Amino acid sequence: APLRALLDAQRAAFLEDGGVPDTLRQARLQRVIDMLVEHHDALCAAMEQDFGGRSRVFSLMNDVLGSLASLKHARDQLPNWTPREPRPSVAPFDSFGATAWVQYQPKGVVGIVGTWNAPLFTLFSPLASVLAAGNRAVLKPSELTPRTAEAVAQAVAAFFAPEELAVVTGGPDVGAEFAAQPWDHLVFTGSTAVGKRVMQAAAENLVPVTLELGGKSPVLLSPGADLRNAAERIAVGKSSNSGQLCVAPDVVWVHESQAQAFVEALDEVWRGLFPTIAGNRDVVPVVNERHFARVESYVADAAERGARVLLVGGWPSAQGTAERRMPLRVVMNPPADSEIARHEIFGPALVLNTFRELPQAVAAINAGERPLALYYFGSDEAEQRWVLEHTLSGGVSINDVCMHPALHDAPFGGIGASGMGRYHGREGFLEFSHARSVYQAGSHDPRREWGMLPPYGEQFEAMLRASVTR
Amino acid sequence: APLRALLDAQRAAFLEDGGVPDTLRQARLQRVIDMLVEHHDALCAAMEQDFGGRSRVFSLMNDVLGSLASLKHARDQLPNWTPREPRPSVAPFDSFGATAWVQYQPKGVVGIVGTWNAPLFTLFSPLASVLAAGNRAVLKPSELTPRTAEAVAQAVAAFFAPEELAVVTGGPDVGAEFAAQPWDHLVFTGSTAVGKRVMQAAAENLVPVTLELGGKSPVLLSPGADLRNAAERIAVGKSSNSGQLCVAPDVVWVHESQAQAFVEALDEVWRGLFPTIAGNRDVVPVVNERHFARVESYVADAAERGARVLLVGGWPSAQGTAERRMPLRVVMNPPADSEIARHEIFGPALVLNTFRELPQAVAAINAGERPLALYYFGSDEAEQRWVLEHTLSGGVSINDVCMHPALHDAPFGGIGASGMGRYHGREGFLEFSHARSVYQAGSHDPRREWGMLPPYGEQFEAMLRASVTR
């Protein structure tokens, strides 16, 4: 009842809104920016405590500045997106004055369900597109970052009336009720398995959904790639948030003859990034004991099944285990029925699979679900093109990892099991708009003269038949 | 299994296509064009007999030429849609050579479920966009047009290998198995209630959907509108297919003082279009006795509840009833709990609601579900703008009805209960494509030398804080 009452109040205000001018959308976006600028110290502290020691430097980059960048881009660019677009109209009536256009209008009240790994970005980066399109919104921060959820709730209550932007906090019971409301559009970031249940819940009210989901993002290492450079970039991206990123490298494909050299370079880079693991505040802990036991169970299962497990970047210790801070474990060619071959790792472990011929790796990728991200390292344009043409992933980075979601003017989203829909840029503006085609009649209707109206003319029928051509 | 075996055969062949060049997509579209050109007379005969007398002129114009025009537009225009689109890359790394683009790739195997009221158009017009995007497809014609379904199946089997394009026929049991398959995309046209169940079925496999559904499409008659011109255009569009169109005018809103003039004009026009009703091959029958009883019960139920019912365009007769050919019945101001106020008519009856101030009509529209189409007649540009700004519908026609789905270069689809997603034009190409964002790294990575890598120093932190600005 209280959640529905909030949706109804936003909807009542929207139906009185009518048109939502550019400058009102920009003012709303500016208000969100001003709120984050005012509250970012409290927000970084909350994120740190929620993880049990997540670096405020990483939070500032990933969640605070990442969100601010999305919001500013939408603020500054949306005047280019709102104008209507004239289109050719229906021939031959356009020869008599008929015209046409597409106009974009907000859908109304959008719900946004965030996740815990980037608990501001997964709320405020989709919000930037949602507000640019002229909607009102309700945010549901993750209960796995409850200090952050509460700081976001207090901050929005201080800056916004609830009819314009509101926050709902609570456990997964609240989230479930959230997903069942008749929104005009629902955005969800989270696991593939939960995304299915979100879509089932949305189906009850025909709510369109943006689902940003998961998978095992592969890296393809060209047999001709600079292995030392690839190891550096992959180490930086994989160690970010201790692998707790939706686009983190999950499986690396490397030529058999280059596996050892790659792991050695990966280890050297990682030890230079993290000279200690236990007690190192730069190492992001696994968010909680549940997810720590999850990741560790994949590693232990792989070892029991006979896969070789390598330590990269340090040694485990009692204290690191207690802090949920770990070096990278690399699992070589795990069996297809092992847990780590079948689940998203989302943590400090990595699968390293070897190949003889790069099409062998592409075939394995294609036999699995389509990942949110796919990566290719190399310098052979023909090979790069072949890999992309014969795969499908949500997005791609070439000669780096984890970079394409930071593109403001390109869509960010999945495909297949990694999700549907997108946000960011003009594509994200379109996602939360209805594209409304309009035909406008001309002055003179020639149908009656031409015999096109019943009782139908024989000449008209003759002309219809002469129009059936290749 | 047979249905799944066919999907798997198409999927296996898709994975071997790799890239799908423009010219292959054009050849596929041309083969569909050639098939329809070769078989259109037999298809029009099947459609006539399935309805018990649907005009071969109407079928030729709407199902045959409508489908052909969509396919030829996709064939001729797709080389404009497939090129990759460069985009600004991620700052500051674009100052170091990083680049980006969006590339479009087919999703794979698309299922298309058609309906009976336009049994070719609702298969082949979405198919045009599906094939333009590089996909393979399976079609499910409506079983309410069984001769047409069979003719489509035989025509496709004569012209196409089933791994490229195939047809499945059968009743609701087949339709349910069809909606449960793991397509890469599913297109469904039909009622809102069945669309809900389709979306529920798709959720189990995270299948993205294009749902083209229903509602009660309203006409707003400005008090300044030319009433005779509006009556003429509305009579023509409402009598098309005897109202069995997803964008047919369903409710007309008229100022109280103009209702009589409008109904008199509508009658005069309708009698000119159909001087007789019974035995008149120009009058499309209601497709079968079930839908005939449905439509007639809405009329009866409204009169039983006190609503005035007016005859437009002729007088009912025993012969007309047996043929399922009727004059228009106009139901005035029916109560909100009447069947005709709550259901899509989709036949030869129309609700006429009166207003004293035009905003009353908009308010009532906004209190119901969002319709697939909305129409405005008038000459006041400001009033026209106000109406469109304060309503939302799939599409719109101004000073005509039923025209905007014939736009080749604008999307066609619904919003809210009238559906989600779209086809036609570049928008339809994009519907059945994945838009894959790609970041490509530059030569020199500046992060290390700028202190952006762990171990995190205080100067990097200071630079981050200095970036937190309005």
Side-chain angles (χ1 to χ4, degrees):
Chain A
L3 183 44
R4 180 55 178 275
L6 173 62
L7 173 50
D8 289 348
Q10 292 207 345
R11 180 157 289 149
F14 181 80
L15 291 179
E16 312 175 34
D17 253 344
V20 182
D22 283 5
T23 52
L24 174 53
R25 302 178 194 195
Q26 293 177 310
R28 292 171 171 172
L29 285 160
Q30 186 64 56
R31 191 68 166 168
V32 181
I33 288 158
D34 292 350
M35 181 188 67
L36 299 175
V37 168
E38 179 113 284
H39 288 255
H40 71 279
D41 291 305
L43 292 169
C44 284
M47 290 187 270
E48 170 188 284
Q49 295 296 305
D50 279 336
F51 277 74
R54 186 196 200 213
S55 171
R56 305 196 182 188
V57 176
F58 182 80
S59 297
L60 188 51
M61 272 188 294
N62 190 249
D63 278 280
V64 175
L65 290 169
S67 297
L68 283 167
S70 290
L71 292 163
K72 289 178 180 183
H73 182 268
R75 177 195 66 195
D76 298 338
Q77 291 304 315
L78 70 74
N80 296 310
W81 299 338
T82 57
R84 65 201 225 169
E85 305 186 5
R87 301 291 175 89
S89 187
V90 179
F93 304 120
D94 63 337
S95 292
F96 290 86
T99 59
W101 66 90
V102 172
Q103 62 185 53
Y104 303 103
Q105 295 171 244
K107 296 189 180 183
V109 185
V110 180
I112 299 170
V113 177
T115 190
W116 53 264
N117 72 293
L120 299 183
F121 188 85
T122 60
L123 295 175
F124 291 103
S125 195
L127 184 64
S129 295
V130 168
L131 292 177
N135 304 289
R136 292 167 187 264
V138 185
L139 308 178
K140 204 290 170 180
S142 169
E143 70 282 9
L144 265 70
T145 45
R147 298 170 187 74
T148 306
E150 179 64 9
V152 169
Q154 290 180 298
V156 170
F159 273 71
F160 290 90
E163 295 83 14
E164 207 168 44
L165 179 64
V167 181
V168 166
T169 64
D173 60 315
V174 175
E177 182 191 1
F178 194 97
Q181 303 300 310
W183 308 103
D184 297 299
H185 197 104
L186 178 62
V187 178
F188 169 81
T189 303
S191 70
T192 293
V194 171
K196 286 181 172 149
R197 303 294 169 198
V198 173
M199 189 175 174
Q200 292 182 319
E204 273 282 3
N205 292 287
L206 287 168
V207 178
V209 292
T210 302
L211 303 177
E212 305 262 353
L213 311 181
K216 297 175 70 66
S217 294
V219 177
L220 300 146
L221 300 182
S222 172
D226 182 335
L227 270 191
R228 267 211 57 85
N229 179 260
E232 173 164 42
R233 296 191 179 166
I234 289 163
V236 167
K238 177 63 177 196
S239 74
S240 294
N241 222 33
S242 290
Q244 302 172 112
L245 293 178
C246 63
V247 295
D250 190 290
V251 174
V252 176
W253 291 90
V254 67
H255 192 274
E256 296 175 336
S257 63
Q258 292 169 344
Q260 152 194 309
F262 172 73
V263 172
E264 290 177 353
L266 195 69
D267 177 71
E268 172 179 349
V269 171
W270 203 288
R271 294 184 193 263
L273 298 169
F274 308 103
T276 63
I277 302 300
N280 187 348
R281 289 175 188 258
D282 296 341
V283 174
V284 176
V286 173
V287 63
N288 63 18
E289 294 179 335
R290 166 184 172 192
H291 287 292
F292 183 71
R294 180 183 62 72
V295 173
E296 295 312 302
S297 73
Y298 298 167
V299 178
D301 170 81
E304 188 189 26
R305 288 175 180 272
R308 178 170 300 271
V309 182
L310 308 169
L311 289 169
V312 162
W315 294 268
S317 58
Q319 179 188 343
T321 295
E323 300 177 356
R324 304 185 309 277
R325 286 181 173 121
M326 303 294 289
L328 186 63
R329 273 61 51 74
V330 175
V331 182
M332 307 291 309
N333 294 314
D337 54 2
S338 69
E339 302 294 322
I340 203 174
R342 288 186 284 109
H343 301 279
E344 185 167 4
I345 300 177
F346 214 80
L350 183 81
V351 174
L352 186 60
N353 282 337
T354 55
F355 63 83
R356 292 307 313 172
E357 300 168 338
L358 196 59
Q360 291 176 322
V362 165
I365 293 165
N366 290 345
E369 303 287 348
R370 288 173 171 172
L372 185 57
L374 175 148
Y375 304 109
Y376 168 86
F377 283 75
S379 64
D380 178 337
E381 182 177 359
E383 187 184 78
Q384 175 187 130
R385 189 179 181 103
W386 189 92
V387 162
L388 294 194
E389 158 178 346
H390 289 84
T391 56
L392 198 57
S393 64
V396 172
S397 294
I398 294 163
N399 286 323
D400 205 353
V401 297
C402 307
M403 294 297 323
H404 60 277
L407 291 166
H408 300 310
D409 274 303
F412 168 54
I415 177 74
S418 59
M420 64 182 67
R422 72 284 175 88
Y423 60 97
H424 289 164
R426 184 173 179 265
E427 279 83 6
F429 170 89
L430 293 171
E431 181 82 343
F432 307 112
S433 296
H434 175 58
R436 197 182 193 191
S437 304
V438 181
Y439 172 96
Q440 184 171 283
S443 45
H444 180 70
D445 175 7
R447 284 174 307 181
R448 182 171 300 272
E449 303 150 354
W450 289 353
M452 308 183 43
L453 300 183
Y456 297 118
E458 274 176 317
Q459 300 196 248
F460 173 61
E461 187 175 359
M463 296 294 307
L464 291 176
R465 293 192 61 81
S467 300
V468 183
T469 59
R470 300 186 63 195
Chain B
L3 183 49
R4 180 56 178 274
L6 169 65
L7 173 48
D8 291 342
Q10 292 208 348
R11 177 156 292 153
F14 179 79
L15 298 147
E16 292 171 348
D17 283 337
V20 185
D22 287 356
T23 56
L24 174 55
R25 306 180 192 194
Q26 292 174 313
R28 293 167 170 175
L29 285 161
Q30 189 63 56
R31 188 75 171 160
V32 179
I33 289 159
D34 294 346
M35 179 189 69
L36 293 172
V37 167
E38 164 138 7
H39 290 294
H40 69 99
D41 289 301
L43 294 170
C44 287
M47 285 179 281
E48 184 181 359
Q49 299 178 68
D50 279 333
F51 277 68
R54 178 175 195 240
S55 171
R56 297 197 188 187
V57 179
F58 188 86
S59 298
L60 181 56
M61 178 163 42
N62 288 79
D63 280 282
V64 177
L65 291 172
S67 298
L68 284 176
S70 295
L71 294 158
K72 291 183 183 192
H73 182 264
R75 174 196 69 196
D76 293 341
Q77 292 299 310
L78 62 83
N80 293 313
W81 301 336
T82 55
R84 61 161 82 166
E85 296 176 21
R87 301 288 179 95
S89 192
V90 180
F93 304 118
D94 59 347
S95 290
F96 295 76
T99 58
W101 68 89
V102 172
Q103 57 182 62
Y104 302 103
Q105 295 174 247
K107 297 193 183 177
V109 180
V110 180
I112 300 175
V113 178
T115 189
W116 54 264
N117 74 299
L120 305 186
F121 184 88
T122 59
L123 296 174
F124 292 103
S125 188
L127 180 65
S129 295
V130 167
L131 295 174
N135 301 289
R136 293 162 182 261
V138 184
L139 310 181
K140 167 60 171 68
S142 169
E143 74 279 23
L144 268 62
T145 42
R147 297 162 193 83
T148 304
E150 178 63 14
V152 163
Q154 293 177 358
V156 171
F159 274 72
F160 289 88
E163 295 80 14
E164 216 167 29
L165 182 68
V167 179
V168 179
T169 63
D173 57 316
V174 177
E177 178 173 34
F178 196 99
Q181 299 304 310
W183 310 103
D184 298 294
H185 198 106
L186 177 65
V187 179
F188 168 84
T189 303
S191 70
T192 293
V194 173
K196 260 183 181 57
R197 293 151 174 70
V198 173
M199 188 177 173
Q200 294 176 307
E204 310 197 33
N205 287 102
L206 286 165
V207 178
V209 287
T210 301
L211 301 181
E212 300 267 352
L213 314 170
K216 296 174 76 58
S217 296
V219 178
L220 292 304
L221 296 179
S222 166
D226 177 341
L227 286 192
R228 280 197 158 273
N229 174 78
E232 180 177 38
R233 302 208 177 154
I234 287 161
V236 168
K238 179 60 181 195
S239 67
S240 296
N241 225 28
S242 291
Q244 302 170 114
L245 289 179
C246 65
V247 297
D250 186 290
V251 178
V252 176
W253 290 90
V254 69
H255 192 269
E256 292 183 344
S257 71
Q258 292 175 346
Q260 176 177 330
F262 174 69
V263 170
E264 290 178 353
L266 205 66
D267 178 66
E268 176 180 336
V269 168
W270 199 284
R271 291 183 183 271
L273 295 173
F274 308 103
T276 61
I277 298 195
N280 185 351
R281 287 172 169 84
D282 293 346
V283 176
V284 176
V286 175
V287 60
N288 65 21
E289 189 61 22
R290 181 176 100 67
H291 280 296
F292 184 67
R294 177 184 65 73
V295 169
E296 292 309 302
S297 77
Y298 294 176
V299 178
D301 171 78
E304 290 160 6
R305 288 170 195 258
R308 178 144 198 77
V309 181
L310 312 174
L311 291 174
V312 163
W315 266 94
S317 63
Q319 183 184 335
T321 290
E323 299 177 0
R324 303 186 308 278
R325 289 183 169 124
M326 300 297 294
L328 182 72
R329 270 61 50 71
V330 175
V331 181
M332 309 279 292
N333 291 312
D337 62 343
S338 68
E339 304 289 334
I340 204 178
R342 290 169 23 238
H343 291 92
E344 179 167 9
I345 298 171
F346 218 81
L350 183 67
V351 171
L352 189 56
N353 284 341
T354 53
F355 64 79
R356 291 189 190 182
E357 294 173 3
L358 186 62
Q360 292 178 312
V362 171
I365 290 158
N366 290 343
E369 300 296 340
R370 287 174 166 173
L372 182 60
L374 178 141
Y375 304 112
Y376 169 85
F377 289 75
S379 56
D380 176 344
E381 204 295 296
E383 180 182 82
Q384 175 184 130
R385 174 193 320 118
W386 190 93
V387 168
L388 297 189
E389 287 180 352
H390 289 83
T391 61
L392 203 53
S393 64
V396 175
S397 299
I398 296 164
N399 289 324
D400 204 354
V401 296
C402 306
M403 295 300 316
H404 60 280
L407 294 165
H408 299 316
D409 274 300
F412 171 53
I415 181 71
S418 59
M420 57 182 70
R422 77 289 207 231
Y423 61 93
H424 293 161
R426 182 168 182 267
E427 283 75 15
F429 171 88
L430 294 171
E431 182 80 346
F432 305 112
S433 294
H434 183 54
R436 197 182 195 189
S437 298
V438 184
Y439 171 92
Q440 182 165 269
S443 27
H444 177 71
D445 172 4
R447 287 174 304 185
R448 188 178 289 283
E449 56 204 37
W450 280 99
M452 313 183 200
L453 299 184
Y456 290 134
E458 296 173 291
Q459 281 221 92
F460 180 55
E461 194 176 349
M463 285 179 280
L464 289 177
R465 291 189 60 84
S467 308
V468 180
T469 62
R470 305 186 65 202

